[PDB]
Amino acid sequence: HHHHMASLTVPAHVPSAAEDCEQLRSAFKGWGTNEKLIISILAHRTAAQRKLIRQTYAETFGEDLLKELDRELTHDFEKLVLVWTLDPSERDAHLAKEATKRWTKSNFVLVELACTRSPKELVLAREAYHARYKKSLEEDVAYHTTGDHRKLLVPLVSSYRYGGEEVDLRLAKAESKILHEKISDKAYSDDEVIRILATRSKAQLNATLNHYKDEHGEDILKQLEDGDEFVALLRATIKGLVYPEHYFVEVLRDAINRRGTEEDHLTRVIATRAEVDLKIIADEYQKRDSIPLGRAIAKDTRGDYESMLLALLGQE
């Protein structure tokens, strides 16, 4: 299904599972270059639809669809179809694990993964991460990170926050000060800074920051500007949990350019948000320059990679 926020679009009359398979299967017969058909099917299907596809494709052809379409993962296009076709859970598991290795190390991505998903989601990902790797997302994150970084990161990915909306203004008042005094003391990684940012609900966390911005004046982000990595990680955490849209848009920004485009990050945002809130992220982008994400995307990418992107972006 595609929500008020999602960009993903599916047919009004969707083909059956067996239907998508015969056609998708028939996109591999001898000339292998039927991207358009693959892009037109996979990119216009919901997650539960792609799962049943994947299951019916295995049971009627005895072969694994993904293995069938992960032939050349070095190419942006083929790497996008994978990530995307994947269930949002395995997809996070993959990103989560990639995020903790030498050659693709990003603590920013871990945070993105822990803060910009709902709690249940972070848990179905922790669940995919068991299946796929026989290990914890926090077991690994704990292992591959250290000091301040590890202190903020483990609790972040292992926290399974209340997800209702009820706030507690009284608590929000106090917690906003703990944060403040601690920020001002340069006690950036102080237990109270970490505890508040990693355990409280998204909701509570938001009452906490408004009340912060009035009294104290500036938004909490204005006092966590530069710093080292940990401060930057804090800066990412706050945005992911409370301002997920500006976060993704700043990410699309730093990934799209006339010249050197970071297809890895663009594929990451587009794929992981298309079925969640990319349609709104797209807007926030527009606002900035009145340049549709779609344009900028079509201006600094091409081939099937480009198509696939626009098709996921809810535009073409």
Side-chain angles (χ1 to χ4, degrees), residues 165-180 195-196 200-216:
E165 308 303 305
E166 32 279 88
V167 307
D168 181 295
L169 291 161
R170 319 186 70 183
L171 181 54
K173 221 162 180 177
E175 255 153 25
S176 179
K177 283 187 187 179
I178 296 189
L179 264 180
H180 180 289
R195 184 182 64 71
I196 306 197
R200 298 303 188 198
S201 78
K202 288 276 182 47
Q204 175 50 41
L205 213 41
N206 185 45
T208 301
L209 299 213
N210 294 168
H211 174 77
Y212 178 105
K213 66 204 306 174
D214 316 281
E215 307 299 22
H216 308 293

Side-chain angles (χ1 to χ4, degrees), residues 18-57:
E19 301 183 303
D20 288 332
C21 285
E22 211 175 62
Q23 294 287 299
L24 206 46
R25 170 64 175 184
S26 292
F28 306 127
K29 297 196 66 165
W31 332 303
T33 295
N34 205 348
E35 327 293 2
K36 294 163 183 299
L37 193 181
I38 285 161
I39 297 178
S40 81
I41 302 188
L42 301 188
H44 290 290
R45 295 294 183 297
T46 75
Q49 287 176 175
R50 307 195 292 292
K51 187 170 62 171
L52 185 44
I53 289 181
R54 285 173 68 204
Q55 314 195 304
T56 71
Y57 185 113

Side-chain angles (χ1 to χ4, degrees), residues 74-286:
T74 325
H75 265 55
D76 54 2
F77 172 57
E78 297 167 289
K79 179 175 175 62
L80 170 60
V81 187
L82 256 306
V83 172
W84 162 265
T85 320
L86 282 187
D87 178 75
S89 301
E90 321 176 86
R91 184 167 54 197
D92 289 1
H94 172 56
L95 309 174
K97 183 56 165 181
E98 171 180 347
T100 73
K101 288 163 172 290
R102 181 90 161 182
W103 302 86
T104 54
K105 190 184 178 72
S106 147
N107 283 147
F108 290 89
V109 163
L110 294 185
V111 174
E112 188 186 304
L113 289 158
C115 318
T116 72
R117 268 62 172 164
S118 64
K120 178 161 290 185
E121 287 169 346
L122 173 72
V123 50
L124 305 164
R126 285 161 67 160
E127 270 186 40
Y129 199 104
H130 287 166
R132 183 60 176 75
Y133 314 121
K134 271 73 181 309
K135 287 185 308 176
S136 290
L137 154 54
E138 70 282 37
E139 196 174 7
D140 283 354
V141 161
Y143 187 70
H144 298 301
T145 72
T146 39
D148 279 355
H149 312 324
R150 194 202 283 182
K151 175 174 178 56
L152 184 266
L153 287 162
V154 184
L156 257 181
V157 318
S158 56
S159 179
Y160 178 17
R161 304 180 156 74
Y162 174 58
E165 308 303 305
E166 32 279 88
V167 307
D168 181 295
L169 291 161
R170 319 186 70 183
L171 181 54
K173 221 162 180 177
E175 255 153 25
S176 179
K177 283 187 187 179
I178 296 189
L179 264 180
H180 180 289
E181 72 181 304
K182 293 300 174 169
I183 307 294
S184 186
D185 296 12
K186 297 301 182 186
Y188 296 112
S189 64
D190 183 85
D191 300 325
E192 287 299 317
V193 173
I194 288 169
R195 184 182 64 71
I196 306 197
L197 296 178
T199 70
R200 298 303 188 198
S201 78
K202 288 276 182 47
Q204 175 50 41
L205 213 41
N206 185 45
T208 301
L209 299 213
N210 294 168
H211 174 77
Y212 178 105
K213 66 204 306 174
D214 316 281
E215 307 299 22
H216 308 293
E218 322 151 305
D219 177 75
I220 185 64
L221 288 196
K222 295 285 287 293
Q223 310 188 324
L224 305 171
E225 296 237 65
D226 158 66
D228 50 15
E229 193 181 1
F230 181 71
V231 178
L233 284 183
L234 279 171
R235 175 174 152 270
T237 310
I238 306 271
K239 304 171 176 175
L241 291 167
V242 181
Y243 318 121
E245 272 57 351
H246 286 41
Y247 169 84
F248 283 111
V249 187
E250 292 175 50
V251 175
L252 284 176
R253 280 290 55 192
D254 308 323
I256 307 182
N257 292 137
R258 322 85 282 162
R259 181 182 342 188
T261 267
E262 304 270 53
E263 295 119 301
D264 269 355
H265 307 60
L266 184 71
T267 274
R268 197 183 73 240
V269 175
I270 308 292
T272 56
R273 309 307 285 186
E275 32 191 358
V276 165
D277 69 359
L278 183 49
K279 181 177 193 177
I280 292 180
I281 287 178
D283 273 299
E284 307 296 359
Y285 194 68
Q286 161 200 54

